[PDB]
Amino acid sequence: KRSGFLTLGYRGSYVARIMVCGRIALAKEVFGDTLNESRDEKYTSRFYLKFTYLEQAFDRLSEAGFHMVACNSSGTAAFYRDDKIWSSYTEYIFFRP
Amino acid sequence: RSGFLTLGYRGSYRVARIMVCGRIALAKEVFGDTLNESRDYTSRFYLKFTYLEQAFDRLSEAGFHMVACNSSGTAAFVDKIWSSYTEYIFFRP
Amino acid sequence: RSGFLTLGYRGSYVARIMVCGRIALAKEVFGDTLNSRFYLKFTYLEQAFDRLSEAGFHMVACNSSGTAKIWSSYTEYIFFRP
Amino acid sequence: RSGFLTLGYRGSYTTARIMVCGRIALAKEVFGDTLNESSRFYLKFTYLEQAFDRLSEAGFHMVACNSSGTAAFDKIWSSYTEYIFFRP
């Protein structure tokens, strides 16, 4: 089935890492040869994106017919007391009918 | 004087409740009489007459900084209707 | 699944360990509860970090403030699960 | 003669200057020429153990301790501990 979900993970710290989770057939259709599997899962796996920024991944998902459904963001900071270093991780859940 | 404060915002995209968890001394110092205990979320404390932006101003003037955060927002068929629940962790040295 | 958990306790170096967060996350991690300012509280040997570590939570922040003689401190631990 | 003094200490123990807060008369008496203007000052040629000895020999007792530590992704820890001393 061409329908399904695709989770887009982004681990940033304010060249980051972009993750793609979901069925393999859906990941290869939207992202092509930018996938890099890292198993750590039946018919689904997690991939890392090369030669692709976050905005480009959105354009690939938008043209493929996916829409953002859920978004799980979380960040933690560490300290003088005015300057902090944030380390966030966001998951954008996309779905295609 | 030092310690943590937790905010629990459950909004949509203005009728959102703001849960507060932490020491009673720090919560009373920042929010004052806007603290209320629901006699009906492990703290049962919420904020009256206070939006999320106003809660950030009270924490900033009191000397608290956002050290951690975790948001989770879903969407239903409607653009769309987004329902997000966010937990803010504030800390004052 | 995700969320924060806070463990605050007033000791004299030990009283109850108050728990902050959601009731769903509190009962999922702990088999103990109660009825600071927190409705739920755990009274144990302070080895609840294991019940938090294997459950998926990690210590992300900590703050201990004590005053004097005998010291009366109040420590707050911040745990988070992705 | 009597007053308060605070010793700020910052560290970064992943997976260290010393600050002094108080009156210039009390800070100059305890730490001599080790403190420099940053009132607030920072110490040189002095560790945390030696700073406690200078306050102990001067008559200051530790009355408060506020230790804090924040982490960020097995992570980068940023700890800040200040000791509040007082002499009658």
From Swiss-Prot, chain C:
Q: What is the annotated localization of this protein? A: Presynaptic cell membrane; Postsynaptic cell membrane
Q: Which domain of life is it from?
A: Eukaryota
Q: How does it assemble?
A: Interacts as a tetramer with GABRB1 and GABRB2.
The record describes the protein's role as:
Auxiliary subunit of GABA-B receptors that determine the pharmacology and kinetics of the receptor response. Increases agonist potency and markedly alter the G-protein signaling of the receptors by accelerating onset and promoting desensitization.
Q: What is this protein called?
A: BTB/POZ domain-containing protein KCTD8
Curated annotation (Swiss-Prot), chain D:
- Cell compartments where the protein resides: Presynaptic cell membrane; Postsynaptic cell membrane
Q: Per the UniProt record, which residue ranges are transmembrane?
A: none
Say which domain of life the source belongs to.
Eukaryota
Its quaternary organisation is: Interacts as a tetramer with GABRB1 and GABRB2.
Role this protein plays: Auxiliary subunit of GABA-B receptors that determine the pharmacology and kinetics of the receptor response. Increases agonist potency and markedly alter the G-protein signaling of the receptors by accelerating onset and promoting desensitization.
Protein name as it appears in the record: BTB/POZ domain-containing protein KCTD8
Higher taxonomy: Eukaryota, Metazoa, Chordata, Craniata, Vertebrata
